[PDB]
Design a protein that fits this description.
Layout lengths: L2 H14 L2 H15 L1
Organism: Human immunodeficiency virus type 1 (HIV-1)
Protein name: Gp41
Length: about 35
């Protein structure tokens, strides 16, 4: 879709631009819970 292009921007800027990483890391750890 067209609105998907927008999300791609905010998403791309993500893979582009520490702390948030360490916090996001736990998100992956959450998988453990399953």
């Amino acid at each position: 879709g067209i609105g998907a292009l927008f999300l791609g921007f905010l998403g791309a800027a993500g893979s582009k631009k520490k702390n948030e990483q360490e916090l996001l890391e736990l998100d992956k750890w959450a998988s453990l819970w399953n």
